Every structure is written in C-alpha cells, then in structure tokens.
mmCIF file of C-alpha atoms and ligand atoms in Angstrom:
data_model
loop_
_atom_site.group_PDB
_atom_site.id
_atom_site.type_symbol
_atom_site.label_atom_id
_atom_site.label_comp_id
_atom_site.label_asym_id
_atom_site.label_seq_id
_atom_site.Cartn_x
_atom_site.Cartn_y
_atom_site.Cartn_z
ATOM 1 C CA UNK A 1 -1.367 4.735 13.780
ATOM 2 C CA UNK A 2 -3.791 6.630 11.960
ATOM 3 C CA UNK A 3 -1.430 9.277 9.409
ATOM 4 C CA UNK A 4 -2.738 12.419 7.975
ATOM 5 C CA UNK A 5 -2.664 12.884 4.012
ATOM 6 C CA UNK A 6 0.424 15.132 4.294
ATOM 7 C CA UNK A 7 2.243 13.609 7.132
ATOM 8 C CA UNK A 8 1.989 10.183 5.115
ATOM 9 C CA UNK A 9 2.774 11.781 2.160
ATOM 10 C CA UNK A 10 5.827 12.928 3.880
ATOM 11 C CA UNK A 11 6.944 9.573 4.820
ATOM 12 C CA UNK A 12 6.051 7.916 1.493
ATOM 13 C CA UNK A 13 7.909 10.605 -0.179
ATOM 14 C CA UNK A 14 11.277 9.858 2.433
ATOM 15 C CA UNK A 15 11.204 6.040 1.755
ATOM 16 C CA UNK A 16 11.399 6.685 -2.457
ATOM 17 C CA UNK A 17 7.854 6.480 -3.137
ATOM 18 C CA UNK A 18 7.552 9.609 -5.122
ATOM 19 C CA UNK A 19 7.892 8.338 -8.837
ATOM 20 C CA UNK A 20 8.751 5.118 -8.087
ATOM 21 C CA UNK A 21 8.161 3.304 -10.905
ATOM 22 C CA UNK A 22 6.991 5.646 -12.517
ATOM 23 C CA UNK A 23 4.324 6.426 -10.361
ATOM 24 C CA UNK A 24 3.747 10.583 -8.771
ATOM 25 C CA UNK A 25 3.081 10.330 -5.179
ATOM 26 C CA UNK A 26 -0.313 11.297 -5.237
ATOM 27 C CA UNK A 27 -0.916 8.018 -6.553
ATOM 28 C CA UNK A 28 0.811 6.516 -3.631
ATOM 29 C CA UNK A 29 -1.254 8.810 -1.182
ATOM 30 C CA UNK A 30 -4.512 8.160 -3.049
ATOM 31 C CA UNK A 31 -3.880 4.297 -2.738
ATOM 32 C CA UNK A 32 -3.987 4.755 0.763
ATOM 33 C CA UNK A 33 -6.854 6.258 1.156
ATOM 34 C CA UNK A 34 -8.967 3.682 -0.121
ATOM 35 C CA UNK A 35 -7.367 1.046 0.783
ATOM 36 C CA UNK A 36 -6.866 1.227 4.753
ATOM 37 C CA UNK A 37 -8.540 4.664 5.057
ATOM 38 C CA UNK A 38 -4.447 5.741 6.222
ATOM 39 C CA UNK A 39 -4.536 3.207 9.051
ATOM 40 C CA UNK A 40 -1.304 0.866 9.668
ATOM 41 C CA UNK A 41 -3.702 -0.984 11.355
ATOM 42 C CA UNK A 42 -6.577 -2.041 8.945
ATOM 43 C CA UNK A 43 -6.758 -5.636 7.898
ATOM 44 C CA UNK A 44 -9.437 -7.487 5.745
ATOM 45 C CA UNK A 45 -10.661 -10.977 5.350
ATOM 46 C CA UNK A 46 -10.711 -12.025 1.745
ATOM 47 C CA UNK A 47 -12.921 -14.738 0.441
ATOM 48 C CA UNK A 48 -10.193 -17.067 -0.670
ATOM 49 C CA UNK A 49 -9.115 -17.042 3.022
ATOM 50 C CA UNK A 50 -6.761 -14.518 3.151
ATOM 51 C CA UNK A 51 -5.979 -11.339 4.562
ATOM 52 C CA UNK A 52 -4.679 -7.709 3.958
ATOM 53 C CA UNK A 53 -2.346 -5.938 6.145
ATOM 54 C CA UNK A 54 -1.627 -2.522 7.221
ATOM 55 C CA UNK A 55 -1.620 1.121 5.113
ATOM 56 C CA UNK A 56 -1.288 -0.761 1.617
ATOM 57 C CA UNK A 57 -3.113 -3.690 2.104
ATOM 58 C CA UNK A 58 -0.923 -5.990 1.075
ATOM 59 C CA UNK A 59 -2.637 -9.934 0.837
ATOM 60 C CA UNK A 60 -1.296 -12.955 2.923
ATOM 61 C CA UNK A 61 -1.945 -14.785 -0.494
ATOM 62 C CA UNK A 62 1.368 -14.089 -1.758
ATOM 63 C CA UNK A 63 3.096 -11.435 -0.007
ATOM 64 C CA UNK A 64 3.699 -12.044 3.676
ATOM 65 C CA UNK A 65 2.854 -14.685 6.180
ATOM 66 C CA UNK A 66 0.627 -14.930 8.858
ATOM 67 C CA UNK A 67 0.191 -18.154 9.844
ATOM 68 C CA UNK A 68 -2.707 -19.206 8.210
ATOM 69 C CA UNK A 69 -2.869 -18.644 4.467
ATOM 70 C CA UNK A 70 -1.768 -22.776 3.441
ATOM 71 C CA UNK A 71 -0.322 -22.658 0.151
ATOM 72 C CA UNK A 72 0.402 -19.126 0.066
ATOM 73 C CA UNK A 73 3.822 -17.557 -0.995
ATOM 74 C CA UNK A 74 6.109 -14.612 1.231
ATOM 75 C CA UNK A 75 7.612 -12.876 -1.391
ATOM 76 C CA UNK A 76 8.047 -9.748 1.032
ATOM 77 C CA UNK A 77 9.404 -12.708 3.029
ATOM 78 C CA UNK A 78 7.639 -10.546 6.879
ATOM 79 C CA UNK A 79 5.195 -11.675 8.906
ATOM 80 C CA UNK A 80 2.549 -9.788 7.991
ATOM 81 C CA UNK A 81 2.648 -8.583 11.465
ATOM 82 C CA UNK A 82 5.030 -6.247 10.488
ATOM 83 C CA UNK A 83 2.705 -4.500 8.299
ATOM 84 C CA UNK A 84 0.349 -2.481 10.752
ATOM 85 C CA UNK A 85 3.697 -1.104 12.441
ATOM 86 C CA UNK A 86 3.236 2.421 12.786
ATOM 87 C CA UNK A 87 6.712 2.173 11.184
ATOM 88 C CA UNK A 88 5.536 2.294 7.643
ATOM 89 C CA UNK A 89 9.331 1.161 6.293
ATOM 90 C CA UNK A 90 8.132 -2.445 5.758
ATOM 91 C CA UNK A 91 5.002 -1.821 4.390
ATOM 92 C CA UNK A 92 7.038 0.683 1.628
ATOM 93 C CA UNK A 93 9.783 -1.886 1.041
ATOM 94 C CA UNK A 94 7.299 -5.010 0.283
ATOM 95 C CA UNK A 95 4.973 -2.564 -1.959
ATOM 96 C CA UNK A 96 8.059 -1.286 -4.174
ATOM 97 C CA UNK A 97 8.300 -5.210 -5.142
ATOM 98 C CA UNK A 98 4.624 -5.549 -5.968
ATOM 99 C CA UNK A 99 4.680 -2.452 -7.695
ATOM 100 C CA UNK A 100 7.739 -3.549 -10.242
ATOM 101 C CA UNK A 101 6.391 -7.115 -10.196
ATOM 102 C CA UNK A 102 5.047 -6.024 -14.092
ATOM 103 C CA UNK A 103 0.700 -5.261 -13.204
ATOM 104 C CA UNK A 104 2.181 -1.707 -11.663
ATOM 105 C CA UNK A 105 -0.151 -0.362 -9.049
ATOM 106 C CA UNK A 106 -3.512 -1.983 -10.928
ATOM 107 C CA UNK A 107 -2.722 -4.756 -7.870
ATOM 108 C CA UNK A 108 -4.629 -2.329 -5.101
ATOM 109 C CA UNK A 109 -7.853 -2.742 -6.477
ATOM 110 C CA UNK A 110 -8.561 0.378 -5.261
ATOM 111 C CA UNK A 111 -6.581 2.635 -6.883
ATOM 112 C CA UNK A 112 -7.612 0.900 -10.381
ATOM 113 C CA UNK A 113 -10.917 1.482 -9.279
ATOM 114 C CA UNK A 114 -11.022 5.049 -7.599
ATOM 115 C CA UNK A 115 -7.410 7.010 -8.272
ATOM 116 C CA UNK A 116 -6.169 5.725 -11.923
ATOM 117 C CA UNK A 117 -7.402 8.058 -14.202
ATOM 118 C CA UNK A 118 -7.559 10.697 -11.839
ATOM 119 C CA UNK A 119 -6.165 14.203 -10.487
ATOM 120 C CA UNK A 120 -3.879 11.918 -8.347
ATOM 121 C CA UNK A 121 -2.307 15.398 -7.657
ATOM 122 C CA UNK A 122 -4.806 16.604 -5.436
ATOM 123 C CA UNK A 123 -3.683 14.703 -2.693
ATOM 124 C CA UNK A 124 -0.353 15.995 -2.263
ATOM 125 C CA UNK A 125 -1.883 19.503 -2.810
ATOM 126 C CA UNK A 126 -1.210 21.871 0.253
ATOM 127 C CA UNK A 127 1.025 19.514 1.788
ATOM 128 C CA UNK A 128 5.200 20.602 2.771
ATOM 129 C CA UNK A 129 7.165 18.534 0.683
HETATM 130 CL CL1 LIG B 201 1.249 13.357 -7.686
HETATM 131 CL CL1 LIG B 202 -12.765 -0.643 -5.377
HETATM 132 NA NA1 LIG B 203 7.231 5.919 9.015
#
C-alpha cells in the first residue's frame, strides 16, 4: 500500500507516534518519506547483505528476520515479512523500540540526513488530525 502524507499521518498519529519519545509527528511523517517514499512495500539491499523492510525501513541486520541475514539479531522478534503489511501496526511497534534504543531517530539515515534540523511541521500541515 502506497499511504498519502495525511492518511499516514493519521495512522502514525493512532498507533502513539505523535511525540513518542519525544519526537512531533512530522518527524515520523518526514522519515517516511525518504525512507520508502510511503510504501509498505519498499525494501533495499544493503551492502553488508542485508535488507530493509516496509514504510520505516527497518534492517534485517538486527531487527527482524528474513531468512537470510546469518548472524543477525530479531529484536522486533517478526519476520520481516510482516513489515510491508499494509497494516502498518508492526512496522510502528518494532520502530518505537529502535527509537528508545538510546541513538533516537538518527538510526533512519534519512531523517538525520534530510528532516533533522528541519520544519518537520510541514508535513503534518493541512492534514485532519
Ligand atoms: Cl510535527
Ligand atoms: Cl540520506
Ligand atoms: Na494501519
């Protein structure tokens, strides 16, 4: 499923997202962007051999499994599967324990790169909250 800005922001918002952490939902929203251009579906090939999954982005190295990452952890403890569901529940759940696992959201390369710093609000602008 491919969400728009609002509707996602919507559903991020539902599942606790919105200052979670300590972190406004536009960061949340603005994460997404980059990261899986708002498609549960987007996965990526890393060098090391792993792979991102779903909305987030979230790496086989460590934080679900999928088969063929050896020597990599589950702390999200899904298949990583799970993760392109256009249910975005798992996705949330697994990224609230990156997010509090002490780096905050500087793990999504992405947002360090293109949202910290910011008008994170912007995306959440317009939408029915
Ligand atoms: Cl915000
Ligand atoms: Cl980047
Ligand atoms: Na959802």
């Amino acid at each position: 499923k491919v969400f728009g800005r609002c509707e996602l922001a919507a559903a991020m918002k539902r599942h606790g997202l919105d200052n979670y952490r300590g972190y406004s939902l536009g960061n949340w929203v603005c994460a997404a962007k980059f990261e899986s251009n708002f498609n549960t579906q987007a996965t990526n090939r890393n060098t090391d051999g792993s792979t991102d999954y779903g909305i987030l982005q979230i790496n086989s190295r460590w934080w679900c499994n999928d088969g063929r990452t050896p020597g990599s952890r589950n702390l999200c403890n899904i298949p990583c599967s799970a993760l392109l569901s256009s249910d975005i529940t798992a996705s949330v759940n697994c990224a609230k324990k990156i997010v509090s696992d002490g780096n905050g959201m500087n793990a999504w390369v992405a947002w360090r790169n293109r949202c910290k710093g910011t008008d994170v609000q912007a995306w959440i602008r317009g939408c029915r909250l």
